[PDB]
């Protein structure tokens, strides 16, 4: 499912900001 | 007449903000007044720790930023904004700033300690929120953004990781590190990949409207359990956002779908929050039809979840981070650069 793909993704961990 | 009651409130509100905005508070404490216990989170140039004020007995959470590190990445105006805005504001759903000071090496903001954990941690655990539960949080972000915007502030970094749950089961917004008081347009490329309005991505210059866009991304993560635009590296996430092609979970109610469809609008002149009716288009939506906006401002609603904590200085709703000693160097670093802090 799409839940499943998310859970396997690199980006289920706390997400940093980007900046200049 | 309820609309006029808010107008009055935010007029007296904006008078308070300006007195503190123009004449901000400085060096109201010291490092030696606090016993440092445990780290609650981190960031590019420092960390936030649980602390104990040795003379009052009270617990606080103290942000600590390396002055040298802030300068290396050219982030001075942002760090200066965070403090100026934070010391100025006042609202039931914003973390308080009690003290601030600096020493030779670091900048220090001591905030009221919110012991419930970050929404983020709970949402990942449980999986996802019932819409009523996600309506309870979303509605406190609406009021808070109605507040901030009326002081001409843009938040720019809304996401579960910066929304803290207090003991009564409500929200304290933290991380005002990209907050900026602006009338008109600004062009800074900042935020978290999964929450960026497409206008930002497209180097267009943008406004308050990006905060309405994030509110939709946030609600969708709260109710689905995952964000509407995701992948394994930022550049793939960026393409999805400009593409302007969302897809909703089948459980999402149809009122939720119509709300999100209106906040996750690429066209800025159609997005809820950037229209002639303003924020009221959001407040008056059917998905928010059961929401007593004043019970929520007054904190008399029954929170659908209260986090368990067994006495003050309990850190059990927070993750574990490696510790580090705080070196305060013998020579002032970057004094002139951060001289208003
Ligand atoms: C340009 O980038 C900026 C701008 C301003 C900043 O202050 C920073 C930081 O370096 C920084 C350092 C540490 C943190 C830690 O923040 C924790 C955890 C990360 C997610 N946000 C929640 C936050 N927790 C709290 O602030 C908190 C406050 C009160 N009680 C409990 C928790 C955040 C930003 C920063 F990196």
């Amino acid at each position: 499912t799409t839940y499943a793909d998310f859970i396997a993704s690199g980006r289920t961990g706390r997400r940093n900001a980007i900046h200049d | 007449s309820e609309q006029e009651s808010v107008k009055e409130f935010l007029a007296k509100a904006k008078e308070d903000f300006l007195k503190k905005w123009e004449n901000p508070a400085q060096n109201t404490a010291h490092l030696d007044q606090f016993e440092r216990i445990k780290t609650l989170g981190t960031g590019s140039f420092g960390r936030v720790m649980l602390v104990k004020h040795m003379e009052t007995g009270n617990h606080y959470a103290m942000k600590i930023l390396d002055k040298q590190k802030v300068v290396k990445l050219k982030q001075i105006e942002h760090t200066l904004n965070e403090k100026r805005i934070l010391q100025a504001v006042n609202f039931p759903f914003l973390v308080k700033l009690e003290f601030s000071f600096k020493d030779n090496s670091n900048l220090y903001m001591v905030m009221e300690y919110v012991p419930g954990g970050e929404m983020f941690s709970h949402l990942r655990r449980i999986g996802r929120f019932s819409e009523p539960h996600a309506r309870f949080y979303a509605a406190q972000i609406v009021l808070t953004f109605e507040y901030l915007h009326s002081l001409d502030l843009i938040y720019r970094d809304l996401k579960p990781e910066n929304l803290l749950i207090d003991q009564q089961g409500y929200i304290q917004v933290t991380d005002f590190g990209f907050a900026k008081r602006v009338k008109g347009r600004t062009w800074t490329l900042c935020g978290t990949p999964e929450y960026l309005a497409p206008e930002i991505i497209l180097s267009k210059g943008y406004n308050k409207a990006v905060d309405w866009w994030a509110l939709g991304v946030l609600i969708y993560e709260m109710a689905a359990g995952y964000p509407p635009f995701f992948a394994d590296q930022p550049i793939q996430i960026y393409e999805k956002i400009v593409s302007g092609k969302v897809r909703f979970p089948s459980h999402f109610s149809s009122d939720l779908k119509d709300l999100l469809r209106n906040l996750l609008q690429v066209d800025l002149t159609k997005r809820f929050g950037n229209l002639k009716n303003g924020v009221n288009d959001i407040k008056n939506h059917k998905w928010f039809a059961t929401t007593d906006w004043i019970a929520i401002y007054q904190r008399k609603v029954e929170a659908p979840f209260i986090p368990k904590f067994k006495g003050p200085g309990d850190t059990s709703n927070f993750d574990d981070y490696e510790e580090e000693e705080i070196r305060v160097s013998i020579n002032e670093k970057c004094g002139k650069e951060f001289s208003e802090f």
Side-chain angles (χ1 to χ4, degrees), chain A, chain B residues 1-6 8-11 13 15-203 205-207 209-244 246-269 271-275 277-299 301 303-307 309 311-326 328-335 337-341:
Chain A
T1 64
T2 295
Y3 182 66
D5 296 344
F6 174 68
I7 285 311
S9 89
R11 293 222 126 214
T12 68
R14 258 185 204 70
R15 302 155 288 208
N16 302 329
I18 55 129
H19 47 275
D20 71 324
Chain B
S1 86
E2 189 201 24
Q3 284 69 87
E4 274 309 306
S5 227
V6 180
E8 178 226 21
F9 166 97
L10 291 162
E15 263 210 346
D16 288 331
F17 170 75
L18 284 176
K19 297 203 235 171
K20 295 154 193 268
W21 170 252
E22 307 286 52
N23 175 347
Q26 285 186 278
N27 191 41
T28 68
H30 192 59
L31 195 63
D32 298 302
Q33 309 192 115
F34 298 94
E35 170 215 297
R36 301 167 243 101
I37 298 158
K38 193 162 152 31
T39 299
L40 304 189
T42 70
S44 4
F45 10 80
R47 51 219 300 149
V48 169
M49 286 187 163
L50 210 230
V51 306
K52 203 168 83 218
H53 200 27
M54 270 147 60
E55 82 232 70
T56 69
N58 293 329
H59 293 263
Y60 293 113
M62 174 200 235
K63 199 166 208 157
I64 311 185
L65 301 196
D66 191 315
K67 282 190 282 150
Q68 297 209 283
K69 238 171 272 166
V70 164
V71 170
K72 249 183 191 170
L73 295 153
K74 328 206 166 282
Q75 295 297 299
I76 296 159
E77 211 64 53
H78 292 153
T79 60
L80 290 173
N81 282 345
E82 178 180 31
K83 178 238 163 202
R84 197 152 164 217
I85 284 154
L86 244 181
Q87 62 92 40
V89 297
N90 179 42
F91 207 65
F93 311 129
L94 297 175
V95 76
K96 264 118 73 289
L97 186 73
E98 310 282 2
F99 304 117
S100 86
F101 56 105
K102 73 193 138 179
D103 65 22
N104 275 161
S105 278
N106 327 305
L107 304 171
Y108 305 81
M109 278 158 272
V110 187
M111 309 168 266
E112 187 219 304
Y113 162 66
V114 202
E118 301 156 8
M119 188 182 312
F120 166 88
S121 310
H122 297 293
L123 182 64
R124 287 293 177 279
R125 202 189 60 258
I126 299 171
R128 76 191 158 81
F129 291 156
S130 81
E131 317 202 352
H133 190 172
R135 167 176 310 112
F136 176 70
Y137 297 128
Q140 301 164 57
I141 295 324
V142 182
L143 278 158
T144 293
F145 287 177
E146 167 162 45
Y147 174 75
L148 292 182
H149 292 356
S150 82
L151 283 17
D152 308 276
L153 304 164
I154 292 185
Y155 185 61
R156 302 201 288 214
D157 193 31
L158 176 82
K159 42 162 180 213
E161 286 95 309
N162 313 338
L163 292 179
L164 279 268
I165 314 292
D166 72 8
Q167 325 176 38
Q168 291 202 282
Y170 286 67
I171 266 168
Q172 297 304 280
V173 179
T174 63
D175 303 67
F176 279 61
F178 293 115
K180 190 195 196 179
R181 203 193 172 197
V182 243
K183 312 206 190 115
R185 276 181 314 186
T186 184
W187 295 259
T188 310
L189 227 181
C190 58
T192 291
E194 285 106 323
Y195 277 79
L196 301 191
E199 59 253 47
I200 298 165
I201 281 149
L202 299 156
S203 337
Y206 59 86
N207 61 1
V210 302
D211 288 324
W212 300 122
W213 172 285
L215 172 71
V217 171
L218 164 65
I219 290 161
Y220 177 132
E221 201 184 331
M222 281 197 297
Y226 51 92
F229 320 112
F230 77 66
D232 278 322
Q233 48 193 320
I235 201 242
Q236 318 174 287
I237 296 174
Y238 298 143
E239 302 151 43
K240 286 210 175 67
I241 290 149
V242 312
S243 99
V246 204
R247 279 179 84 267
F248 294 109
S250 43
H251 51 98
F252 272 23
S253 58
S254 64
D255 300 318
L256 187 54
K257 293 169 165 139
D258 178 71
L259 200 231
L260 292 187
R261 215 131 49 201
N262 275 120
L263 291 160
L264 306 189
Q265 178 55 237
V266 165
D267 183 20
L268 263 204
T269 84
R271 187 177 306 156
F272 272 31
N274 207 50
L275 302 198
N277 264 31
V279 74
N280 306 146
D281 278 336
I282 297 159
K283 298 190 161 187
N284 293 325
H285 194 282
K286 301 84 67 26
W287 189 77
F288 279 113
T290 63
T291 297
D292 184 17
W293 289 103
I294 293 165
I296 294 282
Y297 173 85
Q298 278 161 1
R299 301 178 151 258
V301 173
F305 164 65
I306 277 97
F309 77 115
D314 179 18
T315 55
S316 47
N317 294 287
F318 287 99
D319 286 348
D320 286 315
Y321 298 80
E322 302 230 309
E323 298 292 344
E324 259 165 53
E325 280 313 302
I326 300 319
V328 175
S329 154
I330 66 119
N331 320 263
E332 197 193 52
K333 313 291 194 167
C334 317
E337 284 87 354
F338 298 91
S339 106
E340 93 183 33
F341 196 100

